[PDB]
Design a protein around this ligand. Structure first.
Ligand SMILES: Cc1ncc(COP(=O)(O)O)c(CN)c1O
Ligand SMILES: Cc1ncc(COP(=O)(O)O)c(CN)c1O
Ligand SMILES: *c1coc(C(=O)O)c1
Ligand SMILES: *c1coc(C(=O)O)c1
Lengths: 396, 396
């Protein structure tokens, strides 16, 4: 049965990780990482998370299955984060949330749900996007088409090209939007650009799918949800796939949510029964530990305050590194404009380096980025900034 | 998009659970449960598990993502449980294991892997089986066909009918086998019957898929794996979907494994790269907490000893309830043979009651079973046995 199976493509990131590990130079710096790292180069368990885990160890009396949609309190806290406390969508019971194994799990549940229960055949994704978006949608039998996004000259959002690309989308296609901290570019629509897109989406009959993996990493929890909320004010229907992997440092516990919105309670409940059926046929019901930690924190004033500050600390360190990176490049004689780095949001930016400059950086200097030139600014520290920038200058 | 979606069928078990909760009779007994319960009616967290969770709280320094296939030690301990320490399959590196979100997650990964990378179109499942088997395989685009299994007259394995049904299976079809504690019947092949099936499967060109959700609940860890090991001795290729939900009381933490076996190392590694691709496009990588608890326990002599005894306690309580149930029915004047209950394995048996007797039991006596007459013997206790049996006698 298996004798003729073709191997899956490697698999950079791991290929990159492995090369990085093997490298014996002093010296070496990994900007190809996917996770947050603090100033010491560590990805620690958040203090709010450790405190919550201690409470659960003391208080849990069973591991009996969660419902298919997971912990009720998790769903309620999630909807408040997404839509705002006192949202009409919440008041009118137009939203249903399933706790899922991570953001990826939420995307796959949305995809299986749409493929099985609707006429959706196609999902529109930005060029560029997270490479796994295509894999997820294709796995559910959905075609993926790309829309223009990145202006490689100004390092900004090519808004005209975006709108023009999307005119090819038909009524009933899904359009995927990154809620904030666009991956890989860090370029997000302004609120006014979000509002323009919300109106266009209504007129064109698109089903919005928000991917919200970085809430809190751009400006703050509420501000990062402005775009989503602009859409939610205008649309009868939408889906949100959110993730707590980065903003709770809960990567490996697989903590996400798929939130389904419909015109009214009756309709969302009926549609959600089929979303639950898609979950049941996949992993049955979701992993408790990570989501219970999230619900415990979000629903407790003391823990929530500690967590909000820890998230602020991450957002602030990232922004400080963006600033230090631009200043240091200027100081090491880059002599070209990297100011775009300050205005971009979250962990990731395109450096503007070519694929060959990236290969040179790795081979000659032991500085590792993704082949596209995407760098994780949380791999930068005050201590590694100077040699990092000296290397970059050397390949320009 | 969602206005015309048809609701998913309810959903017994929850429908059953809800009726049970609403019932105001003293009095009431739920045998429709899916989980183990101890003599007090509780599903506690195992002591070995609490101890492991304490160690992880003290020792974890990151939640950084696991690899796509999860924790290496988990995979190694899993293969030893399945195949036996010193197995040729292990020595020859013919097996690769992905940690998955539960047994269901392992089944879906196996199904997506097969649908995408092989000529498999069809999976053969026993009649009866766990109802979610059909849903999982169909979700991946695979047809499900049934093979005969249950002799409703003798309450035994209709081995002739099984073999005759399976002659309709073509070379390259998958045949699903429950490793031990067949669900819902508790009827397992003898070792000699397993050996006969192993030889037939080789001759007919079937790909065996073992579903192993109850290892340790029939006779013991090693004995429960005899059937699987008989197949593994004969086959170049097979898949095992196993679950630790019941034998570790880790239901909600979603702890399972998909183990792929091929003729040799080169072949399994190549095939496994595509299994990892199927995982990546689904939930990306698996939840750490539950599997880390399992690996911690299995790899530590002291914790493993405590856990093995806790599992023995569960297996023994189940067998005691089977015995008490048969004795009590005889004593309450059932006056028909229920001896089959003693010989069946695990939590579940068909009582032999009709759908109408089951409905009567619930309406008149507040005794709840699944509509098929399947009962969970772990819902029985020395204290509830007499009224349970009095009710059953009353509907015969
Ligand atoms: C845009 C985007 N979508 C979703 C994901 C997947 O998140 P998770 O690791 O929670 O599955 C990521 C990675 N955090 C991402 O960058
Ligand atoms: C035969 C069978 N297969 C697999 C499963 C699913 O197991 P899990 O809850 O770990 O997903 C069950 C329920 N334990 C089952 O009875
Ligand atoms: C978090 C997990 O993966 C990423 C990535 O960009 O691949 C972020
Ligand atoms: C464990 C989870 O579900 C069952 C069932 O029979 O449905 C057992």
């Amino acid at each position: 049965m298996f004798e003729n199976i073709t191997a899956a493509p490697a698999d950079p990131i791991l290929g990159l990780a492995d090369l990085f590990r093997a490298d014996e130079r002093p010296g070496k710096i990994n900007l190809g990482i996917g996770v947050y790292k603090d100033e010491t180069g560590k990805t620690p368990v958040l203090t709010s998370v450790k405190k919550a885990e201690q409470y659960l160890l003391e208080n849990e009396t069973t591991k009996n299955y969660l419902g298919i949609d997971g912990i009720p309190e998790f769903g309620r806290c999630t909807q408040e984060l997404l839509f705002g406390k006192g949202s009409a969508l919440i008041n009118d019971k137009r939203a249903r949330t399933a706790q899922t194994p991570g953001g990826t799990g939420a995307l796959r549940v949305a995809a299986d749900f749409l493929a099985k229960n609707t006429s959706v055949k196609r999902v529109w994704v930005s060029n560029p996007s997270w490479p796994n978006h295509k894999s997820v949608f294709n796995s559910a039998g959905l075609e993926v088409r790309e829309y223009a996004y990145y202006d490689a000259e100004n390092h900004t959002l090519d808004f005209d090209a975006l709108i023009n690309s999307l005119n090819e989308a038909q009524a009933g296609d899904v359009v995927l939007f990154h809620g904030c901290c666009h991956n890989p570019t860090g370029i997000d629509p302004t609120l006014e650009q979000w509002q323009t897109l919300a109106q266009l989406s209504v007129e064109k009959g698109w089903l919005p799918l928000f991917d919200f993996a970085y809430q809190g990493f751009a400006r703050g929890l509420e501000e990062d949800a402005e775009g989503l909320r602009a859409f939610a004010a205008m649309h009868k229907e939408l889906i949100v796939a959110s993730s707590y992997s980065k903003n709770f440092g809960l990567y490996n516990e697989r903590v996400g949510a798929c939130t389904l919105v419909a015109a009214d309670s009756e309709t969302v409940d009926r549609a959600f029964s089929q979303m639950k059926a898609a979950i049941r046929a996949n992993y049955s019901n979701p992993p408790a530990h990570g989501a219970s930690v999230v619900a415990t924190i979000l629903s407790n004033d003391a823990l929530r305050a500690i967590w909000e500050q820890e998230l602020t600390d991450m957002r602030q360190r990232i922004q400080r590194m963006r600033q230090l990176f631009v200043n240091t490049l200027q100081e090491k004689g880059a002599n070209r404009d990297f100011s775009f780095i300050i205005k971009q949001n979250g962990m990731f930016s395109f450096s503007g380096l070519t694929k060959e400059q990236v290969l040179r950086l790795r081979e000659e200097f032991g500085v590792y980025a993704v082949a596209s030139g995407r760098v994780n600014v949380a791999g930068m520290t005050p201590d590694n900034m100077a040699p990092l920038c000296e290397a970059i200058v050397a390949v320009l």
